[PDB]
Design a protein around this nucleic acid. Structure first.
Ligand SMILES: [Mg+2]
Ligand SMILES: [Mg+2]
Ligand SMILES: [Mg+2]
Ligand SMILES: [Mg+2]
Ligand SMILES: [Mg+2]
Ligand SMILES: [Mg+2]
Ligand SMILES: [Mg+2]
Ligand SMILES: [Mg+2]
Ligand SMILES: [Mg+2]
Ligand SMILES: [Mg+2]
Ligand SMILES: [Mg+2]
Ligand SMILES: [Mg+2]
Ligand SMILES: [Mg+2]
Ligand SMILES: [Mg+2]
Ligand SMILES: [Mg+2]
Ligand SMILES: [Mg+2]
Ligand SMILES: [Mg+2]
Ligand SMILES: [Mg+2]
Ligand SMILES: [Mg+2]
Ligand SMILES: [Mg+2]
Ligand SMILES: [Mg+2]
Ligand SMILES: [Mg+2]
Ligand SMILES: [Mg+2]
Ligand SMILES: [Mg+2]
Ligand SMILES: [Mg+2]
Ligand SMILES: [Mg+2]
Ligand SMILES: [Mg+2]
Ligand SMILES: [Mg+2]
Ligand SMILES: [Mg+2]
Ligand SMILES: [Mg+2]
Ligand SMILES: [Mg+2]
Ligand SMILES: [Mg+2]
Ligand SMILES: [Mg+2]
Ligand SMILES: [Mg+2]
Ligand SMILES: [Zn+2]
Lengths: 84, 69, 123, 69, 181, 23
RNA sequence: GCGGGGUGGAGCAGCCUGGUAGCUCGUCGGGCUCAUAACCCGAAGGUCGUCGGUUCAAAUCCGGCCCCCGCAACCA
RNA sequence: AAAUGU
RNA sequence: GGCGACACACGUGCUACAAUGCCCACUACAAAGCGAUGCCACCCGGCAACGGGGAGCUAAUCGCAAAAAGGUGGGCCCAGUUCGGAUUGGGGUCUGCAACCCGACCCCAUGAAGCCGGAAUCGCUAGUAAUCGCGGAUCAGCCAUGCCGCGGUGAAUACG
RNA sequence: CGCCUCCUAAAAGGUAACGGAGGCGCCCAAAGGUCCCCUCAGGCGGGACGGAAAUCCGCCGGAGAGCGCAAGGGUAGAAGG
């Protein structure tokens, strides 16, 4: 993973949104293109629509999925099975 | 009890590695035991051997609070 | 059932017998013998139970091993499938998790080869 | 015409002596409004079937319509 | 009889706590242990290795009691069983030998159980009795890895005069029965 | 073996250094 | 009416004598050849027509239904 | 010994 | 986002199945080539990857750089093993805007198939085959076990 | 085509039809005599491997089990183990 001495990577433009909501009014649909972004504790309780190449995946954010990144929770390939 | 088919139950000493000695009865006079009810993690209070680890994940993470604002 | 729950093989060096415990590799093995003052070169069969319980005490407490270890390892994988992230998904389908190539190989994760009446060549 | 959509194959595999003949075609034909007519899809991926044998496979399904069920 | 740890602990420590807990009017109404029946399912000795009197010897070391054989009541095709084949050992522990065993069980045996997170709090009869499963037998102090030939588990039934599961829970708790939940 | 990274041999093969083949 | 039969895709064993489904072809995967067939290596497929009985256990023994094969229906 | 090729 | 998919099928390969071996300590003998937001000694922090400093060198001057097999010494004792390093958990390092898809590396734990491979089939006639390491172009980094090069050790057999 | 059980058979016995349905041509040296002890099928809960069903425990359960083999009668206050 990225080095800890470096900054925990958020996309600034995404993080601004998260914090701008915990004041004004939570919550809503936060359509993103930042799968790169690490989920920050302040994201807890929200629902971020994550892109997968084609479409935005509605993603609730719980406490036990913090250290991860958005992209994990919006898969990019569809399989279902083979010879079925 | 039937004669000639049963093992003898003699007074017996069970000794553990924690020092605890059990005054009981068995078919072996002395027996040493690696673990007992007096030094076992479940029995002996909330002895969480190492496991406080634990339900830290995920957002005790911090390190730190350094995003621009 | 000495240390920890397992009965480590006699007639063999202690730094080796220790490895046969789940939670102990070549590293922790050599450590807990200098850290407890036992020559790793000795056979298990030739030990005083003191040396045993001294080594036993150290090892069983420093790291959680065997059963609770398997639990915590399992629980992590368990947790991953719950959310479920991509790393968690590829555990459900029993596919390579560390992003390997699947088109061939990957057999350690997919069990034995399941040949099938696939496409046919010409007459 | 048809009262339902479907999905079948078309295998022609003659292995006697390297003389020739090998045509493979799977299709999913489905009904249309009663004023359209005929519409054909070239749903073939890459080179799975060569492009030189395309006039004479259209001409094969074509020829089948003339006589019905 | 004789004097033994658990048996003393029952009368001078357990019985009163029970009287206090449930307010019994009669000395005889308060929960006693009746018997502890050990059963070894076996039947690996159906035809295979015909005679397993090694389990009989091991159980005899554990309890100080030579167990009885149980034979197949009826023939079963799928289990490859013929009516009348020896397919199990059962021993019935009462009185002191029941205590002596239950003492070594709680004080030493259950400890040695690998990955022991406590006994099951649901394995109660519903009519005030308890059953538990052991899958190995080197758990017991008189038994080692040396003297063993194969791993062999067993079924333990503890029978008490509690009319209810609740009353029975208490009796076993106070005696030293660990419980996960 | 040449693929075991936990060996002097193995780290030679890959072309890296560490606890099991330091510089 | 009497006798025989129904089992992998095809054709045939096992049935009597209950416990175990087998043989040739075919099909599929791999070889050979420029290629195809032959040929070589390896695999997959029956749930024994179908309902009930008997039995610890039924393709197998018994019974009922349904198909098929053979023979017989004469004095009239 | 050992066939075939729109 | 994908070109990295996965019920499966073929080619080329790397690492193995061990004792002519594997491990650890110490100790040797190459060659070609590269190197100014480059090679980076030497020292310090770290088990380490690496980080912090910092000397030199437009380089027959300084650096990569330790070559590896080998040599002495000790361990393992025939086991799915101190063989084997796949698989997964966990904690890290570096590059880069950024490492979920989809990087490489370090360390702890994990320790799978594999006991020499059916029908079939490849290469090589001498410093060759086999085997052991080294370099380079691409290049932020790297999925190189690929490619193009270099030297160490160094066989067998050819009736026809 | 002889034998056994049931129905037909009209509440004693008996009672016919190319009437309705089954079975027998064996077996057991214990499946025999006697003395002594024991009590089932099934249902619910509980219990390592162990399943619908192996063996263990508890509770309910007068007999619906079992009595080698057909059926009937009998039958645990045994003819059952
Ligand atoms: Mg280990
Ligand atoms: Mg990869
Ligand atoms: Mg309960
Ligand atoms: Mg009770
Ligand atoms: Mg090698
Ligand atoms: Mg057939
Ligand atoms: Mg047929
Ligand atoms: Mg061919
Ligand atoms: Mg039937
Ligand atoms: Mg049947
Ligand atoms: Mg059968
Ligand atoms: Mg010919
Ligand atoms: Mg590609
Ligand atoms: Mg070997
Ligand atoms: Mg192993
Ligand atoms: Mg194997
Ligand atoms: Mg090993
Ligand atoms: Mg190894
Ligand atoms: Mg990891
Ligand atoms: Mg990536
Ligand atoms: Mg070899
Ligand atoms: Mg091979
Ligand atoms: Mg030549
Ligand atoms: Mg290289
Ligand atoms: Mg390769
Ligand atoms: Mg009458
Ligand atoms: Mg009369
Ligand atoms: Mg009789
Ligand atoms: Mg009788
Ligand atoms: Mg019953
Ligand atoms: Mg039950
Ligand atoms: Mg078993
Ligand atoms: Mg009856
Ligand atoms: Mg009969
Ligand atoms: Zn103790």
């Amino acid at each position: 993973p990225r080095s800890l001495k470096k900054g925990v990577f958020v996309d600034d433009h995404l993080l601004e949104k998260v914090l701008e909501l915990n004041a004004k009014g939570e919550k809503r649909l936060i359509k993103t293109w930042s799968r790169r972004s690490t989920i920050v504790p302040e994201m807890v309780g929200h629902t971020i629509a994550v892109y997968n190449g084609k479409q935005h995946v509605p993603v609730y954010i719980t406490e036990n999925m913090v250290g991860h990144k958005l992209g994990e929770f919006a898969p990019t390939r569809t399989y279902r099975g083979h010879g079925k | 009890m039937k004669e000639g088919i049963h093992p003898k139950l003699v007074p017996a000493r069970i000794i553990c590695g924690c020092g605890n000695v059990i005054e009981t009865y068995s078919t072996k006079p002395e027996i040493y035991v690696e673990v007992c009810s007096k030094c076992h993690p479940f029995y002996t209070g909330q002895q969480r051997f190492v496991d406080t680890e634990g339900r830290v994940e995920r957002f005790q993470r911090r390190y730190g609070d350094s995003y621009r604002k | 059932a000495r240390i920890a729950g397992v009965e480590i093989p006699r007639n063999k060096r202690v730094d080796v017998a220790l490895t046969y415990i789940y939670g102990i590799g070549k590293a922790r093995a050599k450590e807990a013998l200098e850290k407890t003052g036992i020559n790793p070169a000795t056979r298990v069969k030739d030990l005083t139970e003191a040396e045993v319980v001294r080594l036993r005490e150290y090892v069983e407490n420093t790291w959680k091993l065997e059963g609770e270890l398997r639990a915590e390892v399992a629980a992590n994988i368990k947790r991953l499938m719950d959310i479920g992230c991509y790393r968690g998904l590829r555990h459900r389908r029993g596919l390579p998790v560390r992003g390997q190539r699947t088109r061939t190989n990957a057999r350690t994760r997919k069990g034995p080869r399941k040949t099938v009446a696939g496409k046919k060549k010409a007459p | 015409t048809i009262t339902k959509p479907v999905d079948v194959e078309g295998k022609f595999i003659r292995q006697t002596g390297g003389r020739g003949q090998y045509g493979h075609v799977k299709i999913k034909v489905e009904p249309l409004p009663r004023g359209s007519g005929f519409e054909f899809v070239n749903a073939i991926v890459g080179g799975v079937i060569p492009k030189e044998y395309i006039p004479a496979v259209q001409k094969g399904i074509e020829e089948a319509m003339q006589s019905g069920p | 009889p004789l004097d033994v740890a658990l048996k003393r602990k029952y009368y001078e420590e357990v019985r009163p706590e029970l009287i206090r807990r449930f307010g019994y009017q009669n000395v005889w109404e308060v929960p006693r242990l009746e018997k502890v029946v050990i059963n070894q399912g076996l039947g690996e000795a159906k035809e295979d290795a015909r005679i397993l009197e090694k389990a009989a010897q091991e159980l005899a070391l554990i309890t100080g009691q030579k167990p009885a054989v149980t034979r197949a009541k009826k023939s079963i095709s799928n289990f490859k069983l013929r009516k009348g084949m020896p397919i199990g050992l059962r021993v019935t522990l009462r009185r002191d030998r029941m205590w002596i065993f239950l003492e070594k069980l709680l004080n030493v045996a259950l400890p040695r159980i690998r990955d022991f997170r406590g006994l099951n709090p649901n394995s109660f009869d519903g009519r005030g009795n308890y059953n538990l499963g052991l899958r190995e037998q080197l758990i017991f102090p008189e038994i080692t890895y040396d003297m063993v030939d194969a791993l062999r588990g067993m079924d333990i039934a503890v029978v008490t005069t509690a009319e209810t599961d609740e009353e029975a829970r208490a009796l076993l708790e106070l005696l030293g029965f660990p419980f996960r939940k | 073996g040449k693929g075991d990274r936990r060996t002097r041999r193995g780290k030679i093969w890959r072309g890296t250094y560490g606890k099991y083949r330091p510089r």
